[PDB]
Amino acid sequence: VTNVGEDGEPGETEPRHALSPVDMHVHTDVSFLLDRFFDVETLELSNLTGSPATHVLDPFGSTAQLAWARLLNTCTYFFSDLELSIQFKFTTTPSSVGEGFVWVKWFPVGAPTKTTDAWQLEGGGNSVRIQQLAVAGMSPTVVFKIAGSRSQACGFSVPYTSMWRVVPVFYNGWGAPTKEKATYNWLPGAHFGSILLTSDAHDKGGCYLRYRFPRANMYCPRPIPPAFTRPADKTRHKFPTNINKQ
Amino acid sequence: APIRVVSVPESDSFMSSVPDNSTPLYPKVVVPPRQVPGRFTNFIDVAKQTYSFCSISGKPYFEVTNTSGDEPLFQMDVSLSAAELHGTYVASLSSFFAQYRGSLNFNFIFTGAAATKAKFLVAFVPPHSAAPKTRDEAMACIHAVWDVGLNSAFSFNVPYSSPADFMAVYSAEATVVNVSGWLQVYALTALTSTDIAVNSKGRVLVAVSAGPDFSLRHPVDLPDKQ
Amino acid sequence: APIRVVSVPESDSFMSSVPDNSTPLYPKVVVPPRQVPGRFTNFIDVAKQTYSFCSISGKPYFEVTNTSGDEPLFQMDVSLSAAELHGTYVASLSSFFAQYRGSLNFNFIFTGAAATKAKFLVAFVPPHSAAPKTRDEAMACIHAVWDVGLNSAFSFNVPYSSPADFMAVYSAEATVVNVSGWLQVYALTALTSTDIAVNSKGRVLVAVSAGPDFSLRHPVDLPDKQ
Amino acid sequence: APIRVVSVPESDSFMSSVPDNSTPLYPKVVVPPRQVPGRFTNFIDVAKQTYSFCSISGKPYFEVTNTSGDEPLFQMDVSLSAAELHGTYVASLSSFFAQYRGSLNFNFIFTGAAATKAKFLVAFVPPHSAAPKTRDEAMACIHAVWDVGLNSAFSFNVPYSSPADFMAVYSAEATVVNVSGWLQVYALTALTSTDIAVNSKGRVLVAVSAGPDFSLRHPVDLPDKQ
């Protein structure tokens, strides 16, 4: 068909015996593709004592293209809940922590921080401290053991905290009246919260955070980043698949 | 009194796609409304209602001189990881998956002087031979001819024809399911200008719109970066 | 016969906010009635239907002499942890949380001699500049003027205007979401008395009522004491 | 609040035939239609509507000369692992199981010259004696006589008669349940030809159709290969 292009809007051609659908597009559905615990991030827990580095659940950064990174940066604004599932890969001899309680405490956008000691469990001597803000209360704590536990993991819901009617991925402006190099693409708390992990462990194991993004709503499309170099002109790119040749 | 149950052997395991959520640790969190327009539910949706420039040579367009004729103008192995279809939206979307089942459309936006005419030919070569290399060989296949001058661009729908209900979003060594063929455009009439002086060459943009029957099935993690 | 089940990996873990109780180890405990009045279900409720003195300097009131004029009378960065709004009910309530979305009200109870008149001006300065420091600078913003003499106090509603649907119940380094601005009151007319002798200064109470659209969302544990 | 349950001792065990599936880790996978004809739901089905050549000597047929008479022509212990019924569809199907309850049918496709006639006799010998070895002994049992010439083949239904409702799909040392007897065919009239010269022998195919009341019950793994 004769196209009078230039005015944005694409242009189709439609052959004969047009092909019937099947699959129904379905597998390309935004909310659907994003409702699955991904393995994103991975950190080191805290010793009960001393001061913590409040971890922040901001999954709008990307880079290692594990097909979840690109997908989040295909939209401009994003609004979804969250759900996590911490696990904890032992790093040495998995029989050196005969208990390991881990005070996974989640915090909502805006919750204070400064967490020094204030708790202490008294029993026959010794007494082991717990992080002040770590204890239980307002913001949901989960205590799971790292011994004999046939899955040193947990997991829960975390409804959308942030103040913004929707989460802006890439911001063009700044985050604070201190037009500073950093607050560019920052914007005050374009995120899902934090988490403080404290356990008698901290060493002898890591974690593997995870996100389940139920009710993912995406707005304002954006271009989708290639993720693979360019090949040799005229031809195909050849990745070893299920199929392949031999 | 106490119910009787039996754990499956699997039991206390992970499952990275359990159809069912987790325990709601924070509740009653009412959420504020959203007034932003340009929202989407489906990804196919955006690549259907939107083209993207295919990368020929390093640019999104071929040339047309008054010294061509026989030679092919543009060629590429119709598979979602073939050179040209590398940078496109439609092709870059694909790699979150494993399969596609769609005929594609291309639009040829001719950009030469308004005193230029080029006339022309496109052709789809189903897989068999080893790349016809002259229209006289290619015209015996499915092709379309077009005359710039008053049009100001054109559209060609590279259909879907193959024995498999879904093909591969990933290219690999010659399979009956990788390659759907080639896409070719030819100089059915070497370009012309007011003066060969002022107007040397004409160009043409190669934009890729997702076809009207096209869809991606099966999400898949990303391999290595290669 | 036996049902088939599968434990989630999480399983035998704590959960400090599981929407669902525990096992009822004592039962049938009927409980006696309660006849005490002044009961409550909601906390916002009490801070709306009740003011609280803001702590200016160490006291809950500013002065008004017949030697003022230009100078600011009262100023504070409208954020629920700014000095003045520190001791108030409404502000102290807040810290069990993380967010607020409300415009506040203040009431100016003038306490000077009954032979004193002071006339006056209040002003709300949205965030931008660096604190106007003369009414001539401040009056170009939203302000109200009031004349004690027969009134016997006054009320000013510092609204809510900002791009975010909820702000921070905790102050911090300058953010677009911390600061909502300043609240200012001015000497639009230096105080007057029967005799400058008997009546030196007049005063005025600064009481803070929660606004009519104000609410706190998100409970949060308390950090450290600082 | 929390439900009360009790795991059976068994609990966290396997179970290689649990009436109930597993956890659906991939979902919504719509599947394409199938247009292939010659489909089946039941296996008995195919062996009923289909014969298979029984392997006598190494071939699927016996001979008929004009020098026979008394001698038996074909004999085999009617049990689904007896020599002849070894290569047949119906018998090879069987070994995925343990039991059968059916009378079988056989068809005798005579292949001798079109100038040949053979006339003849079949006989079913229920289990008792030790194999009659002359028709004069066998004819006193259930038998059928047939005359090739215009027929062009024949059919004999070896019924099911025994005290057990199901028998063994596996043969073994003489049991009341293994052996159902023998199947025998005889030369009730030694073959004849235009010339004993041109036509020496006539032959006959022994095809095995599953009976009309035949069925296999009980699937069973395969033992060793012997």
Binding site: F32, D81, S157 | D20, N21, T23, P24, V30 | - | -
Partner: peptide
């Protein structure tokens, strides 16, 4: 989205997720 089990609403949708308006 990927929650097609008839136990998802053990926790009613208030505790489960959020709400808009």
């Amino acid at each position: 989205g990927n929650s097609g089990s008839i136990v998802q609403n053990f926790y009613m949708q208030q505790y489960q997720n959020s709400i808009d308006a």
